[PDB]
Design an enzyme around this catalytic site. Structure first.
Site: not given
Length: 96
Positions: A54, A65, A69, A85
């Site tokens: 990731e 963050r 992702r 998320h």
């Protein structure tokens, strides 16, 4: 389950940045970018440990963050984006 495919150009521009850093093996903005992703909830196809990794997709203005992702799979051209998320993923198509 994977929620379809998505063109890279349809994702935030930071996703293109993250993919470019993956292509150079970094270095990344965070030292934990590049850890194994365990796929612990099995949303993505079942693979052995270490198949997935990731990487942050930066959220503008975020102190943390954020929720975005890229998860790489070991297969060629296999990358997933989540904007929520890790709840959902789409396969990223770098050709469009």
């Amino acid at each position: 389950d994977v929620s379809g495919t998505v063109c890279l150009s349809a994702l935030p521009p930071e996703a293109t940045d993250t993919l470019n850093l993956i292509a150079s093996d970094g270095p990344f903005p965070y030292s934990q970018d590049g850890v194994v992703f365990q796929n612990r909830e099995s949303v993505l196809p079942t693979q052995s440990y270490g198949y997935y990794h990731e990487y942050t997709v930066i959220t503008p203005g975020a102190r943390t963050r954020g929720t975005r992702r890229i998860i790489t799979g070991e297969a060629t051209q296999e990358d997933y984006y989540t904007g929520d998320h890790y709840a959902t993923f789409s396969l990223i198509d770098q050709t469009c």
